[PDB]
Nucleic acid binder design. Sequence first.
RNA 1: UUUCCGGUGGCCAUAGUGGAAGGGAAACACCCGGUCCCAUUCCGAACCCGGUCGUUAAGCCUUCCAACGCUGAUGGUACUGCACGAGGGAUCGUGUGGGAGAGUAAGACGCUGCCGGAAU
RNA 2: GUCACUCAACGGAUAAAAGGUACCCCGGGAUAACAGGCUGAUCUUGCCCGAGCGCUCAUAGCGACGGCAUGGUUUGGCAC
RNA 3: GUCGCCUCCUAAAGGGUAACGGAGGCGCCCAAAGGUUCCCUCAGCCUGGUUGGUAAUCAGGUGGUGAGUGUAAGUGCACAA
RNA 4: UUCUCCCCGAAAUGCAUUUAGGUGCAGCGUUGCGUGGUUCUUGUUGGAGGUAGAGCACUGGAUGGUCUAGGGGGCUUAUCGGCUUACCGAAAUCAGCCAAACUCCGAAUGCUGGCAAGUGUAGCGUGGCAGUGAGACGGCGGGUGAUAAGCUUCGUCGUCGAGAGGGAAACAGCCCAGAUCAUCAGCUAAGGCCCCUAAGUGGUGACUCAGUGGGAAAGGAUGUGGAGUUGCGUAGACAACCAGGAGGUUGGCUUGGAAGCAGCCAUCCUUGAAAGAGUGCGUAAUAGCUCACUGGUCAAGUGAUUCCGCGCCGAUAAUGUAGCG
Lengths: 78, 179, 136, 126
Amino acid sequence: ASSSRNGRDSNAQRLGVKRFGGQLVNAGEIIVRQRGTHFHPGDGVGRGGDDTLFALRDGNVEFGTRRGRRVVNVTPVE
Amino acid sequence: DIIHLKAEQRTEFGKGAARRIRRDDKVPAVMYGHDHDPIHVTLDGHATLLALRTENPLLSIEIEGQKPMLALPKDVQRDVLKGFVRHVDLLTVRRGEKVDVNVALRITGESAPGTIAMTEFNEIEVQADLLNIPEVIEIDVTGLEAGTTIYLGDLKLPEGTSLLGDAEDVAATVAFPET
Amino acid sequence: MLIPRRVKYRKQHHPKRTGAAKGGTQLAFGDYGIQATEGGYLTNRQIEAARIAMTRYIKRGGKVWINVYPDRPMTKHPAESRMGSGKGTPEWWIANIKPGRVLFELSGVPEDVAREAMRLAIHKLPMKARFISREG
Amino acid sequence: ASTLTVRKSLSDRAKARARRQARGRKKIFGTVERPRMVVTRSSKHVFVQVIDDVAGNTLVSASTMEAELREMSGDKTAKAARVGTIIGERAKAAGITKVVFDKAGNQYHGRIAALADAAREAGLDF
RNA sequence: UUUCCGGUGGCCAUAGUGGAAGGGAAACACCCGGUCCCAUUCCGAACCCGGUCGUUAAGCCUUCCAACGCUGAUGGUACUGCACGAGGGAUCGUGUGGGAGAGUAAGACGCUGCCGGAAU
RNA sequence: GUCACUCAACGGAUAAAAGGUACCCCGGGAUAACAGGCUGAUCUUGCCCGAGCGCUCAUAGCGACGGCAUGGUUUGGCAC
RNA sequence: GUCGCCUCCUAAAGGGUAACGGAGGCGCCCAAAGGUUCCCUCAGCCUGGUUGGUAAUCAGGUGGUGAGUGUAAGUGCACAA
RNA sequence: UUCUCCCCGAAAUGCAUUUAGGUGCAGCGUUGCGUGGUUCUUGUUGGAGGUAGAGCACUGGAUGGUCUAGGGGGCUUAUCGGCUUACCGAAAUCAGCCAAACUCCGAAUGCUGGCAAGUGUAGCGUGGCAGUGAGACGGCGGGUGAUAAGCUUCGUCGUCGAGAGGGAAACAGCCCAGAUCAUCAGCUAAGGCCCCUAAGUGGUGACUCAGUGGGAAAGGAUGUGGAGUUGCGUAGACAACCAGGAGGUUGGCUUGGAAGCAGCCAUCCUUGAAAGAGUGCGUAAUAGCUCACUGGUCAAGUGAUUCCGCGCCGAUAAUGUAGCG
Ligand SMILES: [Mg+2]
Ligand SMILES: [Mg+2]
Ligand SMILES: [Mg+2]
Ligand SMILES: [Mg+2]
Ligand SMILES: [Mg+2]
Ligand SMILES: [Mg+2]
Ligand SMILES: [Mg+2]
Ligand SMILES: [Mg+2]
Ligand SMILES: [Mg+2]
Ligand SMILES: [Mg+2]
Ligand SMILES: [Mg+2]
Ligand SMILES: [Mg+2]
Ligand SMILES: [Mg+2]
Ligand SMILES: [Mg+2]
Ligand SMILES: [Mg+2]
Ligand SMILES: [Mg+2]
Ligand SMILES: [Mg+2]
Ligand SMILES: [Mg+2]
Ligand SMILES: [Mg+2]
Ligand SMILES: [Mg+2]
Ligand SMILES: [Mg+2]
Ligand SMILES: [Mg+2]
Ligand SMILES: [Mg+2]
Ligand SMILES: [Mg+2]
Ligand SMILES: [Mg+2]
Ligand SMILES: [Mg+2]
Ligand SMILES: [Mg+2]
Ligand SMILES: [Mg+2]
Ligand SMILES: [Mg+2]
Ligand SMILES: [Mg+2]
Ligand SMILES: [Mg+2]
Ligand SMILES: [Mg+2]
Ligand SMILES: [Mg+2]
Ligand SMILES: [Mg+2]
Ligand SMILES: [Mg+2]
Ligand SMILES: [Mg+2]
Ligand SMILES: [Mg+2]
Ligand SMILES: [Mg+2]
Ligand SMILES: [Mg+2]
Ligand SMILES: [Mg+2]
Ligand SMILES: [Mg+2]
Ligand SMILES: [Mg+2]
Ligand SMILES: [Mg+2]
């Protein structure tokens, strides 16, 4: 008959933004899982080995632009 | 010539309002210019179709409360299958003034039966005056055959109608038949 | 028969056949033309039949433009076989026609014989179509 | 006036200095705790300013342009060292203590290094 | 206080690209050297050092030019949540909310903060 | 702390394993062969267009390229 | 024919989502191809030039990402990763 | 797999499986205890996006035009060099296009925070007990398949499953609506009101004459109503009816014949109020019959053309009308 040379696929990795704008986060809380820097680390946000953006401090998450880059900041809580 | 159209204020906007107007057998139009805010009006469908039969006519819009004012139909959205006018963009003109418009190219020349004249454009942007709008721009290719081509910088344009488009591209072509 | 030299992917999903014509609803090259009033798939064999009809009727004069191109491949399941075992091999090449699309254009021919040639062509197409002109 | 992209038609030396300055600024950034010391080393003068990059303002500054130093006879390196001592004194006056040094696209050497060491001796923590 | 200019940010083309004209008081710059720290995968070109004579030719700066690019409504259309409806069928229509892309008028030859300079 | 598995049938039945049954024996229409049902690709019977063939003459009679359907009797698809 | 892992599409703008659906990869490699610090900007194109040719090396001009990335693809990266 | 009633009430999915009709865990049920608005709906306000649509900046696909490097064919004749390049033609450029694995763009929804209001008594934690892990059809958005299946495989909502009652002739999955019991009360939903069959052979205005209604396509048709656009017309239109309906010219390649009729063309001139190298019928081949156009008695509307409403043909299987019940 016939057969397919396809049928392989990788497991779902579950990327994407995990905390949206204004959401209160704790220090170290993961903000976005991603491959490559679609979002760059902004103020109060660190970037991990697999390009995960996480919170360096408590506060509220905001998405903005720092110079020419899309960045994610954590504004310290009032 | 001046074509007079009666219009009244349009205040309901959106697809529902436009559908209701077209079912009422009118046509929406927006009339804008370089001096005043856009005016949203509705026109009679039959009168609009009759006026827009010709290309680049000079319309006078009369609103009962307002005064008649002179415009040109710059963008006419017509139905594709049916010929109905779906929407009109009216651009206001200041009587004594100048305008940029498109005039239709046509062939009125005859060559040897081997070669047939062809038009490389439907319309050409020609800067003319309001009161003398060229209905058609005519180019005659008679006695010319082979592979001669005509660009946009050599036309028998009527007086007062300067060329605004590029003059470094071809407009008319005569070449052997579809061999 | 119009067949593309190559395509990125030979096995593709069926083209969307919803909506009106995305573009190319107006004459761009010729004086007269065929405008499809209904959507559908237009195979290269149908395109060739219509083009042959138009050219043969207009004889030597005038020129014909084929506005659409059958660049979408259609696979066929292997004959007499149960469902499954992957997608088939491309067997047909079609163009995605939507209402208002200008299919063929003609120039350099008087209007009456142009109309007759367009009628000959239209009787070969699988969807309803009409003769259009630049208002003469 | 900053525009990311290096201005086209700029002279080759100016483009090189701008690129090097940008790549240093990529990690150099002045906060209230540790403001950014920027030294512009022109061919005839050095201009130093301590900037709070968060607010975008200069806290203290100095230069060879000052009349107290214009007639101070000495070599370019000595004049830069005097400027470094002055800027360190003013930083102590303003209560800065610790700064971050921004060479502004120049090699840390010669006049820039002399000014940096002069500020360090004056008492800036960097 | 103002004007002009040099640095250093912010917005990241309404700022760019290209063309034209003009300017240097401080300043910037090219420029002049390489003895000295230092330097070239060769080269004092660059980096660095020593000068500020020479020069506004260029960078830079000012004015002008919508020309390429960029920005860009209103209205309409596509699509669409919900509720229905019509065709033998591809599929299509309406009500009620939302509503583009393109195109059109148009905008635009940047804006703004801090520090320093020379004059007022 | 680290090492030894193509335990790759990769959550890894045993350290260790191929076949025949028409001599066969002991739940499923959850699932095949027959018939019915749906479908109509294929098949079948028509039809539209008319290049052409028919001294001449598209249509006495034929019908290229293409198009639209009927029937459900062919081969299939589905597995009700 | 397939069985684990990775990338894309299907997947209906979070995530997830099946078919013997559509495309490819993996079972490594590198003592630098890791760390850090400083420096640099490509491909293409045009012109000139011993051997030398479309294309080796050189010069000038142009050119912002179209080159490049150990290895698939995507997301990234010229601030360079 | 055996008595009753009261309250609540599923699943046919995910993952793994020597697993696929089994089973474990999770999901969904119930129940004890605990925690109490945390759930949910709507509004408002803020986020990330790349689908629909659209677009051509990129990557591929593509049509025509311009232009052209460079290849092909020739000669003069070639080492060139020239004529050619009337052929091919990358690239560039102009205009129109195409895309699940293209994007300079980009919704609606959805998702996820803040706030406000509303709200059944929702949500959550932790124990006891499960069942289920064969789904079906319909709407919408997709893959497989042929624009197939009451097909298959996903997303999502609904019903059925596990749902009686009303409607659909009958008719699990469609529409209306969720049955606590009684009632020989009333109002409605979907659907209906000539009779079967409860309620109008309802009122008013149009259309149909096909029993269309009460199945179907490409295509075809002086069906019929309505709405345009446009040519001609009492300088007298269209028909009907009396005279001119022909010279030069048997125009030319044909074909013993193409003289007006085999096929293909410059598609002219004239005695003139009038005519076509020429349209039908006739015809071995010419003849001729007869039309547009030329006058007249008559003459009031004709001739195109488009779109819209409802109809017509195409229409076509086997027990018995038998495709309104
Ligand atoms: Mg790392
Ligand atoms: Mg790592
Ligand atoms: Mg377009
Ligand atoms: Mg715009
Ligand atoms: Mg817009
Ligand atoms: Mg396993
Ligand atoms: Mg074992
Ligand atoms: Mg035997
Ligand atoms: Mg048995
Ligand atoms: Mg069964
Ligand atoms: Mg069963
Ligand atoms: Mg069977
Ligand atoms: Mg049976
Ligand atoms: Mg069968
Ligand atoms: Mg089966
Ligand atoms: Mg099944
Ligand atoms: Mg997703
Ligand atoms: Mg979604
Ligand atoms: Mg599943
Ligand atoms: Mg209950
Ligand atoms: Mg699309
Ligand atoms: Mg369970
Ligand atoms: Mg199971
Ligand atoms: Mg199952
Ligand atoms: Mg199943
Ligand atoms: Mg299912
Ligand atoms: Mg379903
Ligand atoms: Mg499908
Ligand atoms: Mg099914
Ligand atoms: Mg059951
Ligand atoms: Mg139920
Ligand atoms: Mg029921
Ligand atoms: Mg019932
Ligand atoms: Mg019943
Ligand atoms: Mg009642
Ligand atoms: Mg009712
Ligand atoms: Mg009964
Ligand atoms: Mg009655
Ligand atoms: Mg009645
Ligand atoms: Mg009948
Ligand atoms: Mg009937
Ligand atoms: Mg019919
Ligand atoms: Mg009935």
